């Protein structure tokens, strides 16, 4: 089967460089043109670059301005995007893509039938940092429906994952998209609604994982 596996994602300081790769298998790599496409968090798809089947033609989006170089190695079944002089606005998930199957020597239809899995590139002066996990509970100063939660604060880069009670609690859970703070660090909340009566009998623990910083926290949330 066509397989496109990306690597090289990570964090980069402004003005510095990062190289992405896409390893292809399951077809004749050198018979296909390839593209890079990116998507900033919460924004639209944005075309970045094209390389022809044999690498003789390369084209770039207007925002590239000579900073990125697409290349390929047809003997090793790899595609590359070398990105230089990166800026915060280049933060995105980057995808490689290829046309639908075709029988010709050069399959270059500008339709993206097969995509890589995507890899995140985050450009910031921030350094990799694990979150602090704080409880969200109602003021101590009974009766109705209560909300409780965890505030997963000041981490970099995305993403974090949150579960409740090791996945045993899923009903009424809302885990929100992170916001990017003025500090350059992310913060996210996760909440659950429960009857206020359960605050005395039940245990609520939020399980937070931030893989980039090797941070795993289990936080008991108590009234």
């Amino acid at each position: 089967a066509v397989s496109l596996v990306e690597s090289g994602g990570g964090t980069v300081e402004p003005g510095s460089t990062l190289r992405l790769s896409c390893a292809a298998s399951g077809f004749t790599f050198g018979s296909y043109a390839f593209h890079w496409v990116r998507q900033a968090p919460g924004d639209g798809l944005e075309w970045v670059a094209f390389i022809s089947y044999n690498g003789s033609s390369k084209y770039y989006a207007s925002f590239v301005s000579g900073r990125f170089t697409i290349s390929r190695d047809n003997s090793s079944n790899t595609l590359s995007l070398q990105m230089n002089s990166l800026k915060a606005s280049d933060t995105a998930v980057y995808y490689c893509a290829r046309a639908p199957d075709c029988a010709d020597a050069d399959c270059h239809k500008g339709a993206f039938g097969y995509w890589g899995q995507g890899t995140l590139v985050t450009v910031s002066s921030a350094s990799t940092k694990g979150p602090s996990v704080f409880p969200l509970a109602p003021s101590s100063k009974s009766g109705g429906t209560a909300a409780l939660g965890c505030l997963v604060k000041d981490y970099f880069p995305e993403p974090v994952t949150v579960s409740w009670n090791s996945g045993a609690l899923t009903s009424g859970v809302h885990t929100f998209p992170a916001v990017l703070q003025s500090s350059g660090l992310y913060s996210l909340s996760s909440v659950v609604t429960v009857p206020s009566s359960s605050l005395g009998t039940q245990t609520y623990i939020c399980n937070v994982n931030h893989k980039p910083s090797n941070t795993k926290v289990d936080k008991k949330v108590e009234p």
Binding site: H35, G44, L45, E46, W47, F50, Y59, Y60, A61, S62, Y95, P100, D101, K109, G110, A111, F112, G113, W115, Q117, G118, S132, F134, P135, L136, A137, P138, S139, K141, T145, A146, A147, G149, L151, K153, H174, T175, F176, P177, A178, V179, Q181, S187, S189, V191, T193
Partner: protein, 211 residues
């Protein structure tokens, strides 16, 4: 560079509805025009290529038509898994570009949020910052406003919020807002309030606590 546009920007629909959305190019792009679906948090998927051809593996409820500058994409009978953003994309020349997308959501009746306020934790207050959080739970439509107040003074510039993806079961949204204060500012003042306005509320709802 060719400019691709899409209308509407967002569309509310019901399962079973016929959905028709449009795409326009700033010059004649013949039929060099494709359509993609992207479900929240997923990889995009080609549905229609060369204006009207059904992509391999894709079911018949999807179609596209048009040529030149004006194109249409249709779903004959919307299914729940079809709630997504749809993008058009030209390949008339280089540079290639996408349109900005049309986002679908599911219609439901108006629902006012339940509202909850959370003080900063004692854990957080051991350091120099205080975060106050307000939750707006299970509401529709997505538009809502939060106004933070500290000792009855309206806050500006020191909050951020986000909204969940529409719930797949009940078609509601939820919203979380965080007010960020220095510990000193938090300890200086007493009354913390979040005031919520929404179509489902006849007047604003305020939840508050006293530090």
């Amino acid at each position: 560079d060719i400019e691709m546009t899409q209308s509407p920007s967002s569309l509310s629909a019901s399962t079973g509805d016929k959905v028709t959305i449009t795409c326009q190019a700033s010059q004649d792009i013949a039929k060099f025009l494709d359509w993609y679906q992207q479900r929240p948090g997923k990889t995009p998927k080609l549905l229609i290529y060369d204006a009207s051809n059904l992509a391999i593996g894709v079911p018949s409820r999807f179609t596209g038509s048009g040529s030149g500058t004006d194109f249409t994409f249709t779903i004959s009978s919307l299914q729940p898994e079809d709630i997504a953003v749809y993008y058009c994309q030209h390949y008339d020349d280089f540079p290639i570009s996408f349109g900005p997308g049309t986002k679908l959501e599911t219609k439901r009746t108006v629902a006012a949020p339940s509202v909850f306020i959370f003080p900063p934790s004692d854990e957080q207050l051991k350091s120099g910052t205080a975060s106050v959080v307000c939750l707006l739970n299970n509401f529709y439509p997505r538009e809502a406003k939060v106004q933070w107040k500290v000792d009855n003074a309206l806050q500006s510039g020191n909050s951020q919020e986000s909204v969940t993806e529409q719930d797949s079961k009940d078609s509601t949204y939820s919203l979380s807002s965080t007010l960020t204060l220095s510990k000193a500012d938090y300890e200086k003042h007493k009354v913390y309030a979040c005031e919520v306005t929404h179509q489902g509320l006849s007047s604003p709802v305020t939840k508050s606590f006293n530090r």
